[PDB]
Amino acid sequence: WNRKRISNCVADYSVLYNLAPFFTFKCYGVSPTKLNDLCFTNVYADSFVIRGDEVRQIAPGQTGNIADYNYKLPDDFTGCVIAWNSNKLDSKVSGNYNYLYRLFRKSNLKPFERDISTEIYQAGNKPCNGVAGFNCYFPLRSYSFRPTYGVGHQPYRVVVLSFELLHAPATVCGPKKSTNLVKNKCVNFNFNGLKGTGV
Amino acid sequence: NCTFEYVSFKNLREFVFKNIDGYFKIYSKHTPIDLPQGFSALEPLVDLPIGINITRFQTLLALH
Amino acid sequence: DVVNHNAQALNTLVKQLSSKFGAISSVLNDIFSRLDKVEAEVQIDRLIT
Numbered sequence A: 001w002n003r004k005r006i007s008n009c010v011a012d013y014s015v016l017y018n019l020a021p022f023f024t025f026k027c028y029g030v031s032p033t034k035l036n037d038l039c040f041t042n043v044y045a046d047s048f049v050i051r052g053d054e055v056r057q058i059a060p061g062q063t064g065n066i067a068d069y070n071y072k073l074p075d076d077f078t079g080c081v082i083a084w085n086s087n088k089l090d091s092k093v094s095g096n097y098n099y100l101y102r103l104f105r106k107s108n109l110k111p112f113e114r115d116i117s118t119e120i121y122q123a124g125n126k127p128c129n130g131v132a133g134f135n136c137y138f139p140l141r142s143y144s145f146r147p148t149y150g151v152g153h154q155p156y157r158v159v160v161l162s163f164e165l166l167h168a169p170a171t172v173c174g175p176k177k178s179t180n181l182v183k184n185k186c187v188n189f190n191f192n193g194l195k196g197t198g199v
Numbered sequence B: 001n002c003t004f005e006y007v008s009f010k011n012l013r014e015f016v017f018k019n020i021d022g023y024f025k026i027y028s029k030h031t032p033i034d035l036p037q038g039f040s041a042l043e044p045l046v047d048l049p050i051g052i053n054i055t056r057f058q059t060l061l062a063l064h
Numbered sequence C: 001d002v003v004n005h006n007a008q009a010l011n012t013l014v015k016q017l018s019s020k021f022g023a024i025s026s027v028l029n030d031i032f033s034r035l036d037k038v039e040a041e042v043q044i045d046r047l048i049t
């Protein structure tokens, strides 16, 4: 997953909750409706295809096949997860085999870690890493996506946004804009999503 | 494969490297002067989410 | 000791606003801005309690 660095721009979050390529949502830490007034320092985005029954493991700190073996989310995840019913682009008749998923691995994963190793893991006592067969099951196993599947088995084009609520210089902000500065007067203020009253 | 790239005695330079949640965090300090006795806190410089598992390190030297 | 008891009681009353009491943040307006009102009043409820 390419960690695309989103910074120094205005993010219109109200765009991304309307249409077919962005239809099913879950959010943690920040309400998605009040995203248009808040700001973040950096937001890191990823895009990927995973079967719909496995999208349930895309959650803060949860376990599973793609969790332990493909990608772990942090358990303090402040962000939103955006999916898409992607039968038309990622599924073909009698299987589409362009996406690969891990079912066994030597190690449990740490959040936001990446491993592109295709070494065949030792399921049993038989030696592996070059050997194929029993006790040397293949690491990269496809789900064979078809448009005739039920809803759980469908390929889902899922986008993950990771927001940073750090009190650093925030370069990503919503569609709202600023006003003039007033000094030495009891006024209401709002600074990059921080609402308060004072002189 | 280069998934990420970035381009920006007398003196003592201090560095601190640590890994939290894949975010590689870098702290730094410079001063002119084994370890001389003193106190100076390091300031955060570069944060970077490579997510690379790191267990060993090695420093680099200069040759003409 | 009377003066120090008064100052210590007032100061200990001051720093317990920093104590989050199981809520997400010490500052109320951050909870109001980050979340909508329904879970926000639960977090403020823990803070006020």
Ligand SMILES: *[C@@H]1O[C@H](CO)[C@@H](O[C@@H]2O[C@H](CO)[C@@H](O)[C@H](O)[C@H]2NC(C)=O)[C@H](O)[C@H]1NC(C)=O
Residues within 6 Å of the ligand: A106, A107, A108, A109, A110, A113, B053, B054, B055
């Ligand atoms: C990161 O790499 C280290 C180093 O390989 C892993 O730690 C263990 O290192 C010993 C070194 O002798 C190996 O024999 C073990 O097999 C490694 N552990 C596992 C579970 O494989 C460490 O596990 C790696 N981190 C992740 C998240 O995979």
